Design a protein around this ligand. Structure first.
Ligand code: MG
Ligand code: MG
Ligand code: MG
Ligand code: MG
Ligand code: MG
Ligand code: MG
Ligand code: MG
Ligand code: MG
Ligand code: MG
Ligand code: MG
Ligand code: MG
Ligand code: MG
Ligand code: MG
Ligand code: ZN
Lengths: 173, 146, 242, 125, 129, 151, 107
RNA sequence: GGUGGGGUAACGGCCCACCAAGCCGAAGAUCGGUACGGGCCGUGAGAGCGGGAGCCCGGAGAUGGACACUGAGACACGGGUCC
RNA sequence: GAGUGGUGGCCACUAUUAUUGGGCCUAAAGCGGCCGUAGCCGGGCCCGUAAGUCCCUGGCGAAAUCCCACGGCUCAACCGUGGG
């Protein structure tokens, strides 16, 4: 036979030039300030996988099925994508925008640490943001609900000083 | 014609035999299993080949087109057979000299054969004396050894 | 093995009852021939190094063993390839600790702490029984060891019985028969590590192995092979079990 | 030399192409044709696993047993007949099942001289 | 020649229901056809039916109510295990609980819903929806 | 349809469903058996005996009386004849077909060019072989029994 | 006498050393049941067994048959057409590895 | 295939002497073609179709064809002999 | 998008191999006609058996590879502990 070969984690469109899909994806890319299409596609694949797990477990029965069902629900609401009282059916109503709201770049922007999405990306990449006492430099990292409030400037960063000229401009917004 | 047969629960052998029997009428299956292409391929299953130029020729386009397409005769190093290769580009024939060595590959027509208005030509020139022909046509590079 | 015996063992092909990381390195210790078989034993080096953690590298593990710091069934073992198996007793007298080797609920070997007094006895399952020259009876136990008894007591011992042996003197002190109502502990199969009491025994023609039915504490009945049932007491266990 | 591995013919009659060389553990040895002679002659063969066989090539005495369980050591005169091969009796070849004549009567050989190194026979009434 | 009395009955029923017949006669009767008719009546697909005795194998008289979309026999009679009913449902039925499959088990003839409740398999013989 | 000609004739008897003999029938079982034996001794075929019984004596099929000796089965003409030892050695339809074949063969000796009649002979012999296979299976004929026209 | 099969021994005795009932032969392994289809050679029979094989792609069955050569002791002496029971032994010839132990239904 | 032996670490037409005519086959023998086998890998909604170099388990080989010594184990890749 | 093009091969496209699931009056395709051996498919009721078939339960089908949750490298790819 053949040994294992590592495979891509995302899927490409079936047809590269469809006008409606191009327009929709362009709107998303502009709004969330992503670097290239593949990054976007990555998140899409994640969404699809969740749905494909929900569809398979609805039509199943037995002992392992219940365990996997509760594990899926717990994982989904640990990420902050579902409320605490959601049921399995609610999985089938998630959208691509729901996942994009959990990116570290977006959350840094929404919390008011930056004036713009691009500034948030630069702040993350250069190492000015700490999450739960740890510095992370990946703008696409998905933030868990339990750690969302412990996101601040790094304690060694120049921005961790309210008199810094650039921070005062950020606070002005 | 009645119902498709056999449908019986214990008629597996006959059904398998029938399917195997009529699969030989599929031309794609027959050529793969009997390996008919490998038996007549001058390139011997390779994607590219290297050869030596013997002479320059020109081929007329088919009706209702008009024009002359510049090609060369190439003798293959690996087995000594002689084939015809098209030279793509505007004025590309001026960079070819007799006794040069070239790299050729498929021209890319339907069913791995010829394309366009020049049937009978199955290959095209890619390199001349280890230099890309496309560059030479565009410039950006000079043909070595004059 | 084109021309002779194998001397090596890859990590990926190691026995499935060990606690070992199969991708950290290339090679594993090939165990020496000894008391138990491959499926129910582990080399002593892994006990010294990986289980208890008294050593970090193999080189300093061998230095500990050569000083005679480890006792297996009351005897000093220096070979780092020595196999240690089911129902054995591992004693460290310098630290004063004792363990018994037992299968897990999923079939892996673990060390179960025991008291010092219990460390002097070992249960042995009578695996076979034969006549030997001079008209004596030889008993062959499940771990490969042997014992001799006179012709007078030939009716006090049969296969599948359990003998409680005092180690390292190897002196018999108790015989536990195999019958209805005996307390058993399962060593292999799907029902490994479950324990209970014997209810029924069944037999089959033409050499197929025989099956026993066991009732546990909660009152459930389950079947297993007779040779996988290890007698440990009359109506209560005589040794500590997890 | 003498190879005892497998047949080169399938039971249906088709031929078999050999797929490997001959292994050392599959070889035989020359048969020992135990003759009747004035003096006994034997050798020792080193065999697989470092074991030994005692091979008898010339025989002069025999052990003859009666239905009562007693045995006597007597010498061999000749071989009357041998069902194993059609011309063994003429050449005085002793194998298991041969009929020999001794100084106390006819006897039938019960041992394998090529494997044991001794000749044992039962007395015929 | 005649090979399958059960298939003829179901094809006759589905042919008759498409032209608004109110009753039909099944000419060769048998115990299996009676069991299938009983199961069909339990779910409300047909009305009352009765057995008429000639000197031959007997006849069945069946009342139709116009509540059948399609009815057919399954050949060959595939064996099915107690947890494999979904793919056959997708093969023969239009929705996830639309209609019934009729199964012969060692406890009698029944719909596949009852068989799945009891946790047993059997042989598929017909579908109705 | 017909075995060879593939026609679809439907003519036949339409027996009403009844179990007990009719009221107006007055013969007992013994009288019927005596009549059957007498008619057989006159030299009639099994099918002809029933025809005569129906037409002249007003007796519908004798399969309306239980067998007095074997209560599990009803009465038939062949069983009645077997009870007295008058039953045919060879089944009647096979005998009739063989008799038809013998007569036709001697016709074809004087008319070798009558090819249309020869096909009838071939069909008759096909029927004969089907019947002999069936009767061998059920044990009504010895296993070595064979059909040879040259006999 | 019993040899582990729990069936009736044959009526009479024999002197064949290859007889499991009266000789030194031992039986161990599979036990099959079949129909004799040939008895031409001395002390040898051919036994045929039929079974069904399931074709996964076509979800249907086909019929297959297995033929085995077996030793025929004189005390039993099976013939063509009857049901026999056979058991596995050590190799006896190039193709014989079974022995007939019982005739279940004489032809 | 049987009977009687030899040889082997060991059962066996594995090899001999003698007695018989058996054994395989249109449910594909025999012969020819192409290939190391598997766990697995690629693709597809699935049913399927195609491949089986790299990591693990099993087999075989040491320029081609034959043959031996030592040893628990070889007819031995960095041991021996002939063409 | 640190990649993007050319040539050859396999799968899909393809219900152009059709068990699920294709066709044969006029488009490729019903032997010129019939009889019959093996095979496949075979009418109704009653009794028995339990080979096929269904359910429960023992012994097996190495590890790696696949899916899920949790844990360790900044997260991930990767690796460990459990459930399949
Ligand atoms: Mg490979
Ligand atoms: Mg292959
Ligand atoms: Mg390589
Ligand atoms: Mg296409
Ligand atoms: Mg078409
Ligand atoms: Mg026609
Ligand atoms: Mg025509
Ligand atoms: Mg029927
Ligand atoms: Mg069964
Ligand atoms: Mg595994
Ligand atoms: Mg960490
Ligand atoms: Mg993680
Ligand atoms: Mg892992
Ligand atoms: Zn016998």
């Amino acid at each position: 036979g053949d040994p294992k070969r590592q495979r891509k984690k995302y899927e490409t469109p079936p047809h590269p030039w469809i006008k409606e899909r191009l327009d929709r994806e362009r709107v998303l890319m502009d709004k969330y300030e992503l670097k290239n299409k593949k990054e976007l596609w990555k998140h899409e694949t994640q969404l699809k996988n969740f749905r494909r797990r929900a569809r398979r477990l609805l039509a199943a029965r037995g002992k392992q099925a219940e365990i996997e069902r509760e594990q899926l629900l717990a994982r989904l609401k640990r990420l902050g994508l579902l409320p605490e009282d959601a049921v399995l059916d609610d999985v089938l109503s998630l959208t691509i925008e729901d996942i994009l709201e959990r990116r570290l770049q977006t959350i840094v922007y929404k919390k008011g640490l930056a004036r713009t999405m691009r500034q948030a990306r630069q702040l993350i990449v250069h190492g000015h943001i700490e999450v739960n006492g740890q510095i992370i430099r990946s703008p696409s990292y998905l933030v868990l609900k339990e750690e969302e409030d412990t996101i601040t400037y790094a304690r060694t960063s120049p921005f961790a000083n309210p008199q810094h000229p650039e921070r005062m401009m950020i606070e002005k917004a | 014609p009645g119902k498709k047969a056999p449908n019986g629960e214990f008629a597996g052998r006959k059904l398998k035999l029938k399917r195997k029997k009529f699969r030989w009428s599929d031309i794609r299956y027959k050529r793969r299993v009997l390996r008919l292409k490998e038996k007549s391929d001058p390139l011997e299953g390779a994607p590219q080949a290297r050869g030596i130029v013997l002479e320059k020729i020109a081929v007329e386009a088919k009706q209702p087109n008009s024009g002359m397409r510049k090609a060369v005769r190439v003798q293959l190093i690996k087995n000594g057979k002689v084939v015809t290769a098209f030279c793509p580009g505007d004025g590309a024939i001026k960079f070819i000299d007799e006794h040069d060595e070239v790299i050729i590959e498929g021209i890319g027509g339907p069913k791995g054969g010829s394309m366009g208005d020049i049937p009978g030509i199955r290959y095209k020139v890619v390199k001349v004396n280890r230099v890309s022909l496309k560059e030479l046509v565009k410039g950006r590079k000079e043909k070595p050894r004059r | 093995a084109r021309k002779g015996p194998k001397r090596h063992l890859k990590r990926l092909a190691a026995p499935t009852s060990w606690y070992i990381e199969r991708k950290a390195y290339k090679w594993a210790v090939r165990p020496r021939p000894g008391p138990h078989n491959m499926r129910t034993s582990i080399p002593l080096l892994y006990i010294v190094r990986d289980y208890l953690g008294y050593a970090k590298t193999a080189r300093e593990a061998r230095k500990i063993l050569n000083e005679g710091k480890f006792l297996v069934d009351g005897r000093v073992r220096k070979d780092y390839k020595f196999p240690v198996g089911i129902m054995d007793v591992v004693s460290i007298p310098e630290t004063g600790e004792h363990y018994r080797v037992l299968p897990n609920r999923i079939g892996k070997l673990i060390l179960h702490p025991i008291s010092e007094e219990e460390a002097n006895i070992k249960p042995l399952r009578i695996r076979n029984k034969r006549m030997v020259k001079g008209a004596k009876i030889q008993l062959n136990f499940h771990d490969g060891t042997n014992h001799l008894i006179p012709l007078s007591e030939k009716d006090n011992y049969f296969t599948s019985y359990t003998v409680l042996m005092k180690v390292p003197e190897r002196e018999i002190l108790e015989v536990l028969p195999f019958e209805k109502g005996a307390y058993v502990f399962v060593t292999q199969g799907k029902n490994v590590a479950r324990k209970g009491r014997i209810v029924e025994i069944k037999k089959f023609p033409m050499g197929w192995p025989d099956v026993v039915t066991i009732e546990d504490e909660e009152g459930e009945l389950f079947d297993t092979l007779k040779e996988y049932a290890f007698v440990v007491g009359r109506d209560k266990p005589r040794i500590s079990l997890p | 030399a003498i190879w005892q591995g497998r047949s080169l013919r399938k039971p249906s009659g088709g031929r078999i192409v050999l797929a490997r060389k001959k292994r050392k553990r599959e070889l035989g040895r020359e048969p020992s044709n135990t003759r009747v002679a004035e003096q006994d002659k034997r050798k020792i063969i080193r065999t697989y696993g470092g074991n030994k066989k005692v091979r008898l090539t010339a025989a002069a005495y025999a052990n003859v047993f009666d239905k009562s369980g007693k045995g006597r050591k007597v010498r061999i005169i000749r071989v009357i007949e041998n069902p194993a091969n059609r011309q063994f009796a003429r050449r005085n070849i002793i194998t298991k099942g041969a009929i020999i004549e001794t100084e106390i009567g006819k006897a039938k050989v019960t041992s394998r001289p090529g494997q044991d190194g001794v000749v044992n026979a039962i007395l015929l009434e | 020649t005649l090979l399958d009395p059960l298939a003829n009955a179901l094809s006759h029923i589905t042919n008759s229901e498409r032209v608004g017949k109110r009753e039909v006669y099944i000419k060769p009767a048998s115990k299996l056809i009676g069991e299938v008719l009983r199961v069909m009546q339990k779910y409300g697909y047909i009305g009352e039916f009765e057995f008429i005795d000639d000197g031959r194998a007997g006849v069945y008289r069946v009342q139709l109510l116009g509540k059948i979309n399609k009815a057919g026999a399954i050949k060959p009679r595939f064996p099915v295990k107690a947890r494999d009913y979904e793919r056959w449902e997708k093969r023969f039925l239009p929705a996830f609980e639309f209609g019934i499959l009729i199964v012969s088990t060692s406890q009698g003839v029944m719909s596949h819903k009852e068989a799945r409740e009891k946790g047993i398999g059997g042989r598929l013989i017909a579908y109705v929806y | 349809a017909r075995m060879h000609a593939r026609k679809r004739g439907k003519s036949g008897s339409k027996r009403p469903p009844r179990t007990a003999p009719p009221i107006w029938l007055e013969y007992t079982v013994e009288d019927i058996e005596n009549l059957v034996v007498k008619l057989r001794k006159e030299g009639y075929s099994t099918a002809m005996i029933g025809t005569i019984l129906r037409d002249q004596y007003g007796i519908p099929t004798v399969k309306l009386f239980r067998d007095p000796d074997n209560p599990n089965r009803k009465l038939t003409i062949t069983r009645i004849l077997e009870k007295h030892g008058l039953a045919p050695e060879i089944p009647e339809d096979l005998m009739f077909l063989i008799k038809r074949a013998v007569n036709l063969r001697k016709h074809l000796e004087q008319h070798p060019k009558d090819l249309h009649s020869m096909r009838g002979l071939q069909l008759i012999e096909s029927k004969i072989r089907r019947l002999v296979k069936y009767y061998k299976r059920k044990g009504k004929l010895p296993k070595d029994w064979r059909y040879d026209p040259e006999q | 006498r019993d040899i582990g099969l729990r069936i009736q021994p044959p009526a009479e005795k024999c002197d064949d050393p290859k007889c499991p009932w009266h000789g030194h032969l031992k039986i161990h392994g599979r036990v099959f049941e079949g129909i004799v289809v040939s008895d031409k050679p001395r002390k040898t029979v051919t036994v045929e067994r039929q079974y069904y094989h399931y074709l996964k792609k076509y979800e249907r069955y086909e019929l297959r048959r297995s033929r085995i050569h077996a030793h025929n002791p004189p005390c039993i002496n099976a013939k063509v057409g009857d049901r026999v029971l056979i058991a596995e032994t050590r190799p006896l010839s190039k193709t014989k590895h079974f022995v007939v132990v019982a005739v279940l239904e004489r032809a």
